[PDB]
């Protein structure tokens, strides 16, 4: 019985191979047949492509060598630049996505897998498109066998027996995957289930007839999500008594996830691997309160005035000049006034579920809350100890009870609390798995629910604080994401905000409740992806 | 007695100031003497630009309100762009060096300092031009009073007593420094000592004269160092036994400085702010082995290949596929083997005294060391436990003994250890402070030196490793810094380079023993940032 999955790059996980290449290369230049691939392979196991596959050599090094050998084949066979046509076929290499999908799916499904190719020590000026190439594809497999690194090529057999030591297996128990019959022939003397990998379609027919897993027309997987023990875990003293969380993922422009209420850095983990590759550099936060991060008890630390102010300190020691900041609910509330009160730190803003509406001096925060029924809750969060200990006393109760999709709903909004007629073991919400759910009560068991609850009690202040900004409008790129099916951040609360934010943009998310990211990952994505390319980049 | 030092930023601590450019301006565009200037004004207590400065209106809002009052004085007094002429007013201001290092000479003196401005909430496309001004400014400073952010102005009597309060100081305590006279008035009617300022030199001259303390033409001050507590710290697994810390700083290419024997990312204390400040993000490496960094008890753990591998692991856990790699020492070994081995993850290499020597085949790396007197403190530490015993002894003594000048030697190099006949209490050397040498003491204390002198523990493998890269050469950019009194990293020992790495880029510090960064701070950081500015952007 299989319980391992090995495939090659060229031709297998990355498409075009490079056979076809060198042959549209010389149909294109009008050369011999096969002038080119017959340049390439020279000498086979004593050849310039050998050493440069087994990393005697570098590419740069192999580049000239391979100039040597097409001048030989041209006089033997009686403007061209070899470094231009390789730079031209390594870049229009591409992942092939249901290759991917399919090594997915045998992982989690419980099969060990492995990259195992033939490849070279690249140091052009170029090198890096291939470094982001790799990157992206090894995060996904047990292991990456590269024959430059071991000093071993298939179709010698010292690598196969090599993988297999690797992979602490027998050789029935693999399914080898490779594009070039004379690299699988080895595997196939030793016991392996080989396919010859010509199209994808026919690869993966092969690869499901062999394994019993559907992996052909199976559904839309979810986005790549995080692992907390394989991220760069990262912390900033903001003051003396008060440091900051932050998970750490990617290069490029700085954008800093700003969490909700009861939540963490975690409710951003669809986001996370898929803004990173996007080409942002991605710093999750522990919101104050919460995580890893500082959580005072005083119910003043919490004020937006105070939460915004250290979140500019957090810019200053990481020496950030600039983050886009998006927020999800309290973290969407900072979010607008961050924009509002430090644009000069803040390259763009978006929001999602919470819009922007601006303080009403003619009524106390208090009677704005009278005016709407779904707010209700926010006056049982008032009172010091009261919501905390209902939170508290059974936290994977709480977290169940309350990380349901918008047709899940366990919960109602006098004489209560939140679980009123609440079930006590509620059922586990498709939107999430008992590990997730777990996470959750783990970084809770820290420091509860008063910092997080403290969020709510400054209603006055903070009314206060966003009086002063009643004559300014937000005029650097901003973005407002409703979701159709959030019942107390309701689309139609965000209907004015184009007075305030003129240059505002939208998304809307259809069959989405409140936790808008782990409710409908691919579309948050989606819509966040756009709009830092066009707006933040 | 004068405890306090108060700066104003447009005309003191940033040139030219803006009263100066819409006079030139008015000059430049032949207009009426004083039209923009005053336009700028028109209201006083009651115009656009109280309303800006006070933060009630931001500076996007602020430029048509500008506009509609050059228009009123152009009718009054019987191609032109207000966004363009200030867009370049704020751009061509810069730092005034010689006022922030007056500032900083205070600072450092026992003086609490602070920056007080009439200043904008900046919503331009351009504004972060003006934050990294902000930014840079004031980490120099204890506090930052912005007009725009407490919504009172100067020459406003409120300010000034808002400015004793921040300062928790009587006002004949402050000296207070403004380039604008009705801006000075109101401190000098609270008693304050005032300084209009009109050129640096002057103002500088009346600053030294009423605090006593030397500040014009005083000695070229040490680069900007790091306060551990003031850094974000990074925490990476890269595998189940094996964390790796460091602390970053800044944004652009991803710089990863690697530290040599024995020492910790504090040893590029001076490098971190000023590469950081250049537009880049530096990652400064607690070398596995050391300080926050896990520290396995295994000489295996420690062979260049596992030390390399594992940082590689490091960039693919933070989603970089790419960093510059600058190595000190042992940190310049591992970062010629980086270049050698994962090119494609380099985006240039550069090592301080440490040259690029290929591995003799014919020759063990033990017979190697037998060629070279000045390599047998290698072979002392071999035998696990006896330099470990004779390093741990005494921590500050040990530190004390090693970080010294080319001209500070207090060790020599049978019947031995490292201190024999060396003082039991070495003088401070003038490289370092108590504090300094306090922070390595309290790092080692948490590992000791095992770890760190495993590095040596792994010639036969290391050599074995290198002997299959013979065949390359290193063709991505490289930066080789010698340090002319290094008497064991000798300048000549460099002298071939050129044969493996043919378009190598050379740097060279004289009077610099082997402790580089801390013996020559400001020539590392020059050459370093013209090398990454060239070769690595
Ligand atoms: F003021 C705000 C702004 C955004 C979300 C909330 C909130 C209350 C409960 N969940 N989220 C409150
Ligand atoms: F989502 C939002 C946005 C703005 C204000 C509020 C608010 C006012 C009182 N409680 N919450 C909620
Ligand atoms: F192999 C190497 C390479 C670079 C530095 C050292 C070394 C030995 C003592 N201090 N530094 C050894
Ligand atoms: F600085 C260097 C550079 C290269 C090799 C060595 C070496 C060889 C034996 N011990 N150290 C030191």
Known sequence: TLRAAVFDLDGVLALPAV????????????????????????????????????????????????????????????????????????????????????????????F????????????????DGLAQLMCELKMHFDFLIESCQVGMVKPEPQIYKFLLDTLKASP??????????????????????????????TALKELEKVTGIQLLNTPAPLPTSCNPSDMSHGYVTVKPRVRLHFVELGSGPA???????????????????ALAQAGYRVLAMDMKGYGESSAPPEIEEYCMEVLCKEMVTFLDKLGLSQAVFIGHDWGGMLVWYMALFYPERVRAVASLNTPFIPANPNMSPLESIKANPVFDYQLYFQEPGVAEAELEQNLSRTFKSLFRASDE?????????????????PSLSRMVTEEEIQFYVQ????????????????????????????????????????????????????????????????????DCGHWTQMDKPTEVNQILIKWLDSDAR
């Open 409 to 425: 709903s366990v919960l109602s909004m006098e004489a209560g609390g939140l679980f009123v007629n609440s079930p006590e073991e």
């Open 255 to 273: 954008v800093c996830l700003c969490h909700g209420f009861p939540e963490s850095w975690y409710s951003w983990r669809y986001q996370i691997p």
């Open 19 to 110: 056979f076809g290449v060198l042959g549209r290369t010389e149909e294109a230049l009008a050369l011999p047949r096969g002038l080119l691939n017959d340049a390439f392979q020279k000498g086979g196991p004593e050849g310039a492509t050998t050493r440069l596959m087994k990393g005697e050599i570098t590419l740069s090094q192999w580049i000239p060598l391979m100039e040597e050998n097409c001048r030989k084949c041209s006089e033997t066979a009686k403007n061209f630049s070899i470094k231009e046509i390789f730079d031209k076929a390594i870049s229009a290499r591409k992942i092939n996505r249901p290759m991917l999908q399919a090594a997915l799916m045998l992982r989690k499904k419980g």
């Open 443 to 510: 970084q809770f068991k820290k420091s509860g629910f008063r910092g997080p609850l403290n969020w709510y009690r400054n209603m006055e202040r903070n009314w206060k604080w966003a009086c002063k900004s009643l004559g300014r409008k937000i005029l650097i790129p901003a973005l407002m994401v409703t979701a159709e099916k959030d019942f107390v951040l309701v689309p139609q609360m965000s209907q004015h905000m184009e007075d305030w934010i003129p240059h505002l943009k939208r998304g809307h998310i259809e």
């Open 172 to 201: 029935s128990e693999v399914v080898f995957l490779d594009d070039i019959g004379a690299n699988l022939k080895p595997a196939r003397d030793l016991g392996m289930v080989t396919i010859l990998v010509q199209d994808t379609d």
């Open 112 to 127: 060990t897998t492995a990259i195992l190719t033939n490849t070279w020590l690249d140091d052009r000026a170029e090198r």
